[PDB]
Symmetry: C8
Subunit: 181 residues, 8 copies
């Protein structure tokens, strides 16, 4: 009697372990290259994750002519969330903090890759209120080739994001007088 009820448990557990091995093996990541051609040194590298993590620290500071390379990724195991976060640096030469946001979803049926960058007044930690401002209020970019925008304070950026789910985000931060790389 109950034997085939175990057979029903076996079919259920077989389907469930296949689900959890799929949600575990689905990989999402961003390579986040942010290149400082701005003429100003950046410091106090701060990070926030709405989703995901990174296995490495930011550089403490970024002098002129050097890049942040950062490798944020999806949480291990069957978590079903993408990579979504902010990185921010203080720029003491202008009294403002540069923040950069990326979103690399789990579910491309409802979401797509987005990125943004902006300056905020004073020294600020990266947190949820920068994520909300960069992702909803400050008009982020799609992962559909190169885009350029002013930051204010004599600075500018150009950047692009791959549209895949293992995405490269590249940003060059420049003075307004300079041609994008």
């Amino acid at each position: 009697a109950a034997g085939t009820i175990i057979a029903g448990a076996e079919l259920t557990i077989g389907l469930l372990q296949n689900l959890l091995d799929v949600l575990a093996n689905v990989n999402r990541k961003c390579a986040v290259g942010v290149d400082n051609e701005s003429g100003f040194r950046w410091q106090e590298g701060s990070t926030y994750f709405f989703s995901g993590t990174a296995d490495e620290n930011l550089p403490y500071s970024v002098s002129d002519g050097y890049a942040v390379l950062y490798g944020p990724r999806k949480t291990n195991g069957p978590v079903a969330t993408g990579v979504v976060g902010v990185l921010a640096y203080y720029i003491p030469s202008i009294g403002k903090t540069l923040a950069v946001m990326w979103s690399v979803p789990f579910d491309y049926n409802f979401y797509q890759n987005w990125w943004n960058a902006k300056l905020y007044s004073g020294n600020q930690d990266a947190d949820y209120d920068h994520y909300v401002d960069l992702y909803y209020d400050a008009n982020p970019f799609k992962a559909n080739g190169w885009h350029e925008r002013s930051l204010g304070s004599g600075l500018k950026f150009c950047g692009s994001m791959s549209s895949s789910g293992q995405a490269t985000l590249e940003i060059h931060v420049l003075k307004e007088s300079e041609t994008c790389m």
Copy 2:
């Protein structure tokens, strides 16, 4: 009684997991080499995908004597769609944008590899209306050896596409006075 009805579920799930592992493991890609011998610098690399994605960015710009190497691919998982997209660059020295299209289908029973290239007036992002113009209205080429065509504005291209489903697309963009590589 219901036991063999589980046996029917097992035969169904066995056939379905084999289908999804086949549609997952079928690989489609284009290597898209576009070589700038045109005498003019290209900028603001823009991309559109009707199907597929790429794990890398375009170069921001392409100076004379250098090539775009770009590796667009099918979406991961059992998606059953090929690679189909446009890449476009602004050419400020002539006030026009060069666009390049490729199609590398999933289903070779109904489709084949196609490519095209053209100039459009002014700076334009790559999007669906360039895909429709390059794929239906502007007479694309089959993947059957080398073809050559004028762009207007003193420019020309020659290119070819492999007919496989892991295709190489090679295009040389030239001045009208030059012999194709």
Copy 3:
């Protein structure tokens, strides 16, 4: 009752998946080396496939003292067709097109490896009517060692084909005054 009818479906699907894995894993290819010792530059590399594909382009042109290396192969999956095709180049110094044909069958019970080469008047794309002329009307060669023939127009070729199903085709195109390599 129907249980063993599933057992009959299991025996059928087991035999069928073994068939499709055999027809998938059977590999057919030609390495097609065509060496230009003719004293004339070749251009506008054109290709036709009756069966199979290649993952690479032809060279656009072939200057004197250089070779076309081309790697046509069977279609992936359980297709049960070999490699069969034409490659052709225009020779502007004589106003004719050199075409080369190879056939590397799936089914050696009914077919064998064949190759041929000829000049045609004017610039022509490779297509089915060159395949029919080279394979039926123009007396192709078996894969049984080296053969030599005149092209007309002061040119000659010598070539050979391996008889295997992963065949090397080597052709040297020469002036009539020259000893085959």
Copy 4:
């Protein structure tokens, strides 16, 4: 009768071996880099683990301009505990001991990565009372980018921790007069 009761034992043992293989294969570690820019030699490297172990010794001493690299990790087998510990060194030039704490949990539903550093009066071994002081009483830092704090005695540190579960902890110990690396 009892046969299917063995079937119940088989379903139970199958679920349990999968649990123990998951809790075994879940990996937690900290790479603990502590860099001595303090102008003073450190000695008598001491360690405490609340959870986990390391496969290597501390350096006995750390001269000025050199770093402790230490690789503490989770206990092998299905232990279900993270990495949590203290490392401490005596600084004879000031008569105090520098301690550094990290926590890299097993269970991110209830815990997160934390770190701290402080000076204690006299030579002291690392033990549980330093763990309690550094983790509860002395206000530890989250793994959310770079932080800086004074130690007293003319010394300062800046450091950061990755938020992952295979975390990098980097600390630079500096004189109060110096800019963080």
Copy 5:
């Protein structure tokens, strides 16, 4: 009823797939080294297979002090035939063709490795009538160490064959005045 008749089909197919995997994995080959110390250039390399194939061409010609290296092999799949063939070259300096034969059977219960070499009058393709002459009428050698024989026309050969089923055949063709290598 018919259920165990499927059981009989399963035992039959299990025994048959093991047979076909054995006949497929049994490997037979000859490495055929023929070294030209004869003082005369050889040309128009011709080949015949009674059994097997090769994945490479002969050299078109063999100048004095150089060797034919050729790698004939058994047909892929469960074919149950060995390697058996002739290679032949024209020697225009004497008006004769050198032929070399090897046999490397599938079935060592009924056959063994044999080889032979001879000169024939005029230019001739390798075919079945050379195989019959070299294997039955012209007294071939066993694979039992080095043998030497005159060709006529001032030429001689010494050679040996391994007796294995992955055999090396080595032949040195010499002038009658020379000591075998």
Copy 6:
């Protein structure tokens, strides 16, 4: 009837082979580095194992400025014992023998890593009575960072042990006048 009693034997043997494969694959070892900075040559390297073995010999002697590297390990197979042993050397320049002890248990529920070192009067082989003296009577050290102690006879040691179960033991033997490495 007895059929399911075989089923009970199968469940028993399945659980037992999993136990013996776990107790076999659990690895315990010590890397035992003992560094001679003592100014005196050591000789007649002697060893005792209470548990475990080593696949290598001691050096016969250790001159000043050189180290014993020794790799004692758990016995292969499902033995359920750790590594526990003594190594000893005669020091003829002082008429005493240096012994070093380590313990690296199998069962960390009841035991932990311990080490010790001492001088004994005259030449003595390492045996069980040195193990008892070093492990119970002579106050061994825990694997919790660096420790230092006098040997008498003008000599001193500092050392540390990793607390893992694949432990590094490092000892520096020094003159009383010297600062520990």
Copy 7:
């Protein structure tokens, strides 16, 4: 009824395939090094196998100060026979042939490794009558270290054989005036 008779066929075929995979995977070989320090050139390398084969030829000749390296092996598949054979060379400077014999059995319950060497009058092929003379009539050596014997004609040999079943046979052939290597 007949169902369990198939079960009896399954137990029989399972035991038989395990037997044939054991008799197939059991490897027997000899590395046969014969070193010519004799002052005389050897020629016309001849071989006989009572059991086994080799994948390589002998050298045609062996000049003074050079060695025959030869790698005879067991027949592939479940043959249940060892390696047993003779190699022989003509020595024209003395008008005699040196033969060397080795035996490397399959069945060490009834046999052991043996080797021998001798000179025979005139040029002779290696065959069964040399095997019988070297293995029964001419007192062969066991594989139990180095042995030395005179050949007559001013020559001597020393040699040894490993006693394993993947044996090295080393022989130095010397003049009677020389000390064995």
Copy 8:
């Protein structure tokens, strides 16, 4: 009826194949390094095995300042015997033979590693009567660190053996005037 009797045969054969795969995979070996610092050349390397074999020959001779490296091992397959043997060399400068014995058992419940060395009068082959003398009558050494003993005839040895079952045996043979390495 007899069906479950086959089930009893399956449980028996399953337990037996696991036994034979364990007794096959258990590896026993000795690396036997014997170093000649004796001032006298050794010759005619002889070997005896009570258990095991070696895949290599001894050196024929050992000049002063060179070592015998020899790698005796357990017999392949499920033999359940260790490595036990003698190696011996003649020393013509003193008219005696040096023999060395090692024992590396299969069964450490009843046996342990032993070694010995001695000189015997005149040239003698290694055989069972040297094994009996070296293992029972001449007081062998345990594998418990370095030991030293006189040979007579102005010679001495020091040596050690690892206690594992993949043991290193190292022996230095010296003149009585020399300090052990």
